[PDB]
Ligand code: HEM
């Protein structure tokens with residue numbers, strides 16, 4: 421169906437479906453064709469709604485800038501097929517959002533709820549976590565060095581530090597690591613009535629757990645995010661638990677896999693470019709540039725969706741009210757109008773105006789926490805390594821949402 425779809429079926433299938441994202445050489449050439457030939461065009465494949473695919477850096481920014489025109493709330497902000505979206509709606513009392521997180525909201529609601537924590541996530545505030553992050557980073561570096569020159573960088577190291585950081589930011593104690601892992605890896609990881617029961621049950625268990633903290637921080641405040649949210653008010657009243665608990669989940673889930681995935685990306689980049697490892701070791705001031713290149717090149721968030729709320733024009737295309745739009749951050753990050761030799765990992769790349777954290781109204785709340793923890797982590801790691809190389813191929817997550825490296829088998833020499 422839909423006569424406006426011009427993107428060839430094989431191209432559309434590659435960029436929309438999950439499987440392709442397990443392989444850089446499948447996905448990136450498909451987006452390169454789109455950027456060259458059909459930068460912003462409509463695809464319609466079986467099992468999915470018709471959608472515009474924003475492949476250009478300029479277009480992703482322009483759309484992201486305008487939440488009044490391009491909505492997160494009206495449709496699913498996550499790229500589900502029609503079956504899975506139907507399942508989500510039936511579970512969530514009709515609406516296309518599992519929980520009441522920031523990415524489900526439009527202004528002014530979004531502005532209000534984002535505003536509750538926005539200052540806390542700014543660099544000057546985040547800077548106070550440096551000492552705790554340093555300790556956490558060193559612990560992860562240490563458990564890597566406990567291996568005799570061989571391990572999986574993801575499962576044996578990078579899986580842990582970003583979760584512990586996000587736990588420290590929230591105020592979840594170290595001993596709750598198993599539960600938080602269940603949250604991010606099991607529950608939020610990649611019959612019908614039975615699955616619906618397990619879901620409501622699981623989310624209720626996590627919400628009950630989180631409510632314990634909300635209650636605690638109203639009597640015993642701390643400098644963490646739970647305490648900030650528990651004691652926040654709007655119109656002279658506490659924020660409804662559903663918004664608070666969604667905030668805790670959104671922070672933990674958005675903060676863990678993305679950061680681990682990008683760290684893995686860095687290691688892949690450095691293993692394939694040993695000259696750059698030597699560069700980062702000789703000049704540790706380059707590490708923030710290394711961190712930005714890792715995020716650009718890895719681009720662990722593959723897509724978010726928008727719904728057009730009115731008829732409008734982007735790159736001379738007539739986007740109708742109700743039209744769905746896929747924002748491809750990976751494609752924007754390899755846009756040749758912005759980046760020279762985009763497929764190359766290069767830590768000296770400056771400026772590095774990538775869209776790995778998105779752009780506009782919903783731009784990653786955690787970006788400064790992410791950059792700080794990755795910086796600190798690599799500051800601690802790189803001095804301890806003489807060399808690093810891949811021992812086998814990296815395994816990428818087969819997902820069109822939050823993917824990138826899941827396994828990065830490596831060998832290393834200790835400095
Ligand atoms: C390399 C690390 C990370 C990447 C690549 C990343 C990427 C993204 C992207 C693409 C978005 C959507 C932006 C948009 O729609 O314009 C986003 C949103 C968000 N991220 Fe991150 N993120 C990272 C780390 C973190 C961390 C560490 C946290 C929290 C501690 C976090 C919390 C969030 C939240 C709360 C949102 C939703 C903000 C909103 O809807 O207004 N992220 N992130």
Ligand SMILES: CC1=CC[C@@H](C(C)(C)O)CC1
Nearest residue numbers: 521523669670673674721
């Ligand atoms: C990057 C990120 C991934 C998870 C999102 C969700 C679905 C928890 O709101 C929030 C933002």
